[PDB]
Design an enzyme around this catalytic site. Structure first.
Site, mmCIF file in Angstrom:
data_model
loop_
_atom_site.group_PDB
_atom_site.id
_atom_site.type_symbol
_atom_site.label_atom_id
_atom_site.label_comp_id
_atom_site.label_asym_id
_atom_site.label_seq_id
_atom_site.Cartn_x
_atom_site.Cartn_y
_atom_site.Cartn_z
ATOM 1 N N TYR A 196 5.332 -0.799 -7.123
ATOM 2 C CA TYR A 196 6.345 -1.751 -6.605
ATOM 3 C C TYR A 196 7.664 -1.019 -6.256
ATOM 4 C CZ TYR A 196 3.831 -5.960 -8.393
ATOM 5 O OH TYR A 196 2.981 -7.000 -8.668
ATOM 6 N N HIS B 118 -4.894 -16.018 -7.153
ATOM 7 C CA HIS B 118 -4.611 -14.592 -6.903
ATOM 8 C C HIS B 118 -5.809 -13.720 -7.315
ATOM 9 C CE1 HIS B 118 -2.758 -10.900 -6.194
ATOM 10 N NE2 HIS B 118 -2.831 -10.560 -7.494
ATOM 11 N N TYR C 30 11.007 -11.616 -8.857
ATOM 12 C CA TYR C 30 10.198 -10.881 -9.875
ATOM 13 C C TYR C 30 10.003 -9.412 -9.427
ATOM 14 C CZ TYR C 30 5.849 -10.907 -7.126
ATOM 15 O OH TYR C 30 4.909 -10.685 -6.178
ATOM 16 N N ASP D 229 -4.922 -6.980 -3.396
ATOM 17 C CA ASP D 229 -3.529 -6.970 -3.896
ATOM 18 C C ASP D 229 -2.880 -5.622 -3.441
ATOM 19 O OD1 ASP D 229 -1.512 -8.393 -5.856
ATOM 20 O OD2 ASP D 229 -1.730 -6.307 -6.675
#
Ligand code: 5IV
Ligand code: 5IV
Lengths: 303, 313
Positions: B232, B290, B149, B107
């Site tokens: 992020y 995921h 998102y 990830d």
């Protein structure tokens, strides 16, 4: 040789028993080499070996031994018998997922790595002691047959050694020709000079460490003579069959080189080093000579 | 496969900067393999890999990534740009006296190990990503131009409030097999939340136990979601840094593991990586969403060990 700065090390912690965590610093990759300090010392007593051993292609774990520094220091005497300390070092290997390590010890740490080699050879790739000989236990003579007797009764030596930590370490950490010792410190200078071996800053590091738990844990190493002897006797005069190094220090007046004199009989694969002009505090007295003996031996007998 | 009990691991701590300590668990001897988890996870997301990799003859360092668990979580967004995170992982190697490690990431951890391979190849023996592709940065389009998102995650305090409201619900809602998923990540912003249209007391996924969820809950009580969400919040800075590497290939052994049922990091996004990574090998895990390590731990372990044993040892 290059030393260590404590702020800059990888610090590891393993819980080996409910109330018992062992702290170590870790440097390098390659075969696991576990360094085991003596009384009254610190992982930091290896400060000259850790970088040189790492740079020679070894993964160095320099312990705080039980009772010291950031390792747990339970007060009970029997927590510091070789049987308990060895079983904890095996658990340490277990939790780190190490099938074996090289064990290099000095002083009481040396006594422990001999016991490790004797009782857990399958977990010890190779064993090296600075100063501390391996003498097979005599089932006829109790450990009975001053200063070690002064260390026996809990609270007494603690009070003297803890009263002034700077004085304690400045008084102990001396070259053989600088020694101010025959209380331990009754007839010794009140403000000792700095030994040529150590700086004010290095002494201050030991002072800061020994403020955590003081001298009870460390002194308990001396208070298991009968237990250690009983356990040693159970070794049925088996030999140590793994690669072994005995390093003697000419000017260690307690752990004298002659006390190592018959270890080949019991330890067939024994090699030797001897450091001249070297007192009890081998790593910081002759760090260069230590590093060359240890690396030469590791590279030939352990790698 | 055999899992980890946290009380029973070696815990390591390295100061990489004045205010910044990285925590890791360590198991095994052999070549150093550094495991890098994603969002919002833990060293513990590797619980099935750590024993298997150690047993296969590796020295496993499973990180708490910056922002997580026992690792420092400074609040500043820029502490979590790939340039800072990579330089901190190099300092980590330095202080541990490791000349190189194998870097395996999932990830956001996968994104980091690609950047490590790209900018610090001399410190990276080999690189493996779970799910996260390596896409060369396009100097024409900011990732802003290029997943609502992710916009919801931009504004400090907003996603934190939702994710921290009920930690048990957060982790039970996230850690689910693809066919168990209770999240639409599509119109998050307009709906105004990840969990607005998800059960108030979600069922336990078949992937995880109550006890495992409770471990993530305990971990996320230390720092919460700010540090993790800051991963992020560096899209422009990560893109500018990535552009500075334009035209240089990754020449070290590389493994790309795709997950069939990861609907965000979809396997097709990996489709051209051979062009930029000549020495690339691949694994593909069927029926895998995921949360790859804990969805298909056996398949993950076989792929990683097979690859380590052939390309890295
Ligand atoms: O007192 C001991 N070491 C510390 C020491 C040594 C020398 C010195 N200094 S010196 O310069 O040599 C001298 C002038 C003072 C200082 C200390 C200390 F101050 F810390 F006490 C010690 C005692 C027994 C040990 C060990 C390790 C194992 N034993 C059991 C064992 C049993 C059988 C044989 C054997 F050789 C040792 C260590
Ligand atoms: O949101 C991300 N991951 C977390 C995630 C992924 C899937 C899922 N779930 S799921 O089952 O797939 C779906 C049904 C719900 C959930 C999450 C989470 F809940 F945690 F948010 C993420 C995003 C961008 C990333 C990365 C890593 C790098 N980037 C930059 C980058 C830029 C350009 C190309 C690229 F592929 C990635 C990770």
């Amino acid at each position: 040789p290059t030393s260590c700065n404590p702020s800059d090390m990888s610090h590891g912690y393993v819980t080996v028993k409910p109330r018992v965590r062992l702290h170590f610093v870790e440097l390098g990759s390659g075969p696991a080499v576990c360094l085991c300090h003596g009384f009254p010392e610190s992982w930091y007593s290896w400060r000259y070996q850790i970088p040189a051993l790492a740079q020679a292609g070894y993964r160095v774990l320099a312990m705080d031994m039980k009772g010291y520094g950031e390792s747990s220091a339970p007060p009970e005497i029997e927590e510091y018998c070789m049987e308990v300390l060895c079983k904890e070092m095996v658990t340490f290997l277990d939790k780190l997922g190490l099938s074996q390590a090289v064990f290099i010890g000095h002083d009481w740490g040396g006594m422990l790595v001999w016991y490790m080699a004797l009782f857990y050879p399958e977990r010890v790739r190779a064993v090296a002691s600075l100063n501390t000989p391996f003498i097979p236990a005599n089932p006829n003579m109790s450990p009975l047959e001053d200063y070690q007797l002064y260390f026996q009764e809990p609270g007494v030596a603690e009070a003297e050694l803890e009263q002034n930590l700077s004085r304690t370490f400045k008084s102990l950490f001396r070259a053989s020709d600088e020694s101010v010792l025959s209380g331990l410190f009754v007839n010794s200078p009140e403000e000792p000079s700095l030994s040529r071996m150590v700086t004010e800053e290095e002494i201050q590091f030991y002072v800061q460490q020994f403020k955590k738990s003081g001298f009870r844990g460390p002194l308990n190493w001396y208070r298991n003579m009968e237990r250690n002897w009983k356990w040693a006797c159970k070794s049925l005069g088996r030999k140590i069959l793994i690669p072994a190094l005995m390093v003697t220090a000419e000017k260690d007046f307690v752990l004298v080189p002659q006390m190592s004199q018959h270890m080949e009989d019991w330890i067939p694969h024994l090699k030797r080093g001897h450091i001249e002009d070297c007192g009890h505090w081998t790593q910081m007295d002759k760090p260069t000579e230590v590093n060359q003996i240890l690396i030469k031996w590791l590279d030939s007998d352990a790698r």
